[PDB]
Design a protein around this ligand. Structure first.
Ligand SMILES: O=C(CS)NCCCCCn1ccc2cc(Cl)c(Cl)cc21
Ligand SMILES: [K+]
Ligand SMILES: [K+]
Ligand SMILES: [Zn+2]
Length: 355
C-alpha cells in the first residue's frame, strides 16, 4: 500500500451531552470510514494504528496549564464539565473528550512517522475532535489540541529541527491556532483558505486577513487567503491554488505536507455555505501530492454534511492511492479575484515566484 489510513471508532466517544444535535457529531468519522469500506479503498490502504499522544508531546505546542485543565475534565462531574465548556468560545466537553483529543493527535503522529520512515508514501487520518482552532493556551471552536501543529513539531522532533513543513488548511474556517503557533517560524509554512466576510465569520478576527504575513523570521511564511461576499467553489479554489498556493509551496520546497482537511467548504455543508465539490477536493489533493516527494498527510478537521464529507474525503484518499483525478464541471467571482490579488500584493515581496 502506498497510502496509510488511521481510524479508531473510540474517537466517536467525544459527544455533547446537553445539545445532542451539535453539528460536530460522533458519526462524522464513522460515515467517512464506512464510505471507504464500500468504495473498496480501505483494503487498498495500510492500516496505521491509533495511539494516545503523551503529555510531553502535547507540550510541543501547548502550555502546561492548558494541558492540565483539559486533562482534569476526565473525571469531572457534569456540572463541572458544563462550566468548563462555557469558559471557551464554542466548546463542549465530556469525560471522553480528553482521550479522544489524545487519540486524534497520536493517530497523526503515527501517520507522520509512517510517512517519514518510508512505511507509506502518504496517509489519511479520519480523526475527531478537530484541532486547528486550538491555541497554545486555550481551546476554541470544537478544538482542544492543535493536531496539525503538534504533528509538524513531532515530525521535526524525529528528523531535524529545521524540517520544512507545509500546512495547508482548506477548512472553511481560519486556523487561528495554527497561525499563531507558527507565526514567528520560517520552518513551518501555513497557508489557509477561509471564508472571511471582512472579519464577520468564525473565529471573527482580523488575524485571518491577507495582510497578516508572519512575524520576524516568519515574515512571508503565513499566507491567509480570505473569501468575502460570495459562495466560493471549485473555480475560486482552483484559481487560488494556481496563482498562490502552489507557486509559494513550490518555492518553499516542503519536506512534509500536512493538510488541515476540513470539508465544511463542501457543497451541502450547513455551516460553511460554500460549494466545493468532491471532485474539487480531489483536484486540490492531486496538486499537493506533487510536493514534498509525495509525503502528504490528510487530517480531518471540520465538515458537517455527513454525505458531503464521506464523498469528499474518500475522493482525497482515492487520489492518494494514485487514481486519476475526475473531470471538473463557472467564471471566478469578482470578490474572489479581488481576494487573490490582495494576497499576491501582500506576499510578492517575500516570494520571487509571485513576481
Ligand atoms: O467548525 C469549526 C471547526 S473546523 N469551527 C466553527 C466554529 C463555530 C462556532 C459558532 N457557530 C457557527 C455556526 C454554528 C452552528 C452551531 Cl449549531 C453551533 Cl452550536 C455553533 C456555531
Ligand atoms: K482554513
Ligand atoms: K509560519
Ligand atoms: Zn471548519
Amino acid at each position: 500500500p502506498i497510502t496509510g489510513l488511521v481510524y479508531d471508532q473510540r474517537m466517536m466517544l467525544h459527544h455533547n451531552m446537553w445539545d445532542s444535535h451539535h453539528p460536530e457529531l460522533p458519526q462524522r468519522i464513522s460515515r467517512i470510514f464506512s464510505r471507504h469500506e464500500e468504495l473498496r479503498l480501505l483494503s487498498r490502504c495500510h492500516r496505521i494504528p491509533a495511539r494516545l499522544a503523551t503529555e510531553e508531546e502535547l507540550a510541543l505546542c501547548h502550555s502546561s496549564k492548558h494541558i492540565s485543565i483539559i486533562k482534569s475534565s476526565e473525571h469531572m462531574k457534569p456540572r463541572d464539565l458544563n462550566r468548563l465548556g462555557d469558559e471557551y468560545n464554542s466548546i463542549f466537553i465530556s469525560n471522553e473528550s480528553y482521550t479522544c483529543a489524545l487519540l486524534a493527535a497520536g493517530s497523526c503522529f503515527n501517520s507522520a512517522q509512517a510517512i517519514l520512515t518510508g512505511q507509506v508514501r502518504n496517509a489519511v487520518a479520519i480523526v475527531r475532535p478537530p484541532g486547528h482552532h486550538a491555541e497554545k493556551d486555550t481551546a476554541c471552536g470544537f478544538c482542544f489540541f492543535n493536531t496539525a501543529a503538534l504533528t509538524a513539531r513531532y515530525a521535526q522532533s524525529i528528523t531535524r529541527e529545521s524540517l520544512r513543513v507545509l500546512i495547508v488548511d482548506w477548512d472553511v474556517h481560519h486556523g487561528n491556532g495554527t497561525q499563531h503557533i507558527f507565526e514567528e517560524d520560517d520552518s513551518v509554512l501555513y497557508i489557509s483558505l477561509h471564508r472571511y466576510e471582512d472579519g464577520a465569520f468564525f473565529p471573527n478576527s482580523e488575524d485571518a486577513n491577507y495582510d497578516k504575513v508572519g512575524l520576524g523570521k516568519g515574515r512571508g511564511y503565513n499566507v491567509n487567503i480570505p473569501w468575502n461576499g460570495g459562495k466560493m467553489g471549485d473555480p475560486e479554489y482552483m484559481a487560488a491554488f494556481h496563482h498562490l498556493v502552489m507557486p509559494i509551496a513550490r518555492e518553499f520546497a516542503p519536506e512534509l505536507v500536512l493538510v488541515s482537511a476540513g470539508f465544511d467548504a463542501a457543497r451541502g455543508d450547513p455551516l460553511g455555505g460554500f460549494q466545493v465539490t468532491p471532485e474539487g477536493y480531489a483536484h486540490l489533493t492531486h496538486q499537493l501530492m506533487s510536493l514534498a516527494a509525495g509525503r502528504v498527510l490528510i487530517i480531518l478537521e471540520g465538515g458537517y454534511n455527513l454525505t458531503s464529507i464521506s464523498e469528499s474525503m474518500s475522493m482525497c484518499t482515492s487520489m492518494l492511492l494514485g487514481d486519476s483525478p475526475p473531470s471538473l464541471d463557472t467564471p471566478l467571482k469578482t470578490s474572489a479575484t479581488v481576494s487573490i490579488n490582495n494576497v499576491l500584493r501582500a506576499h510578492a515581496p517575500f516570494w520571487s515566484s509571485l513576481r
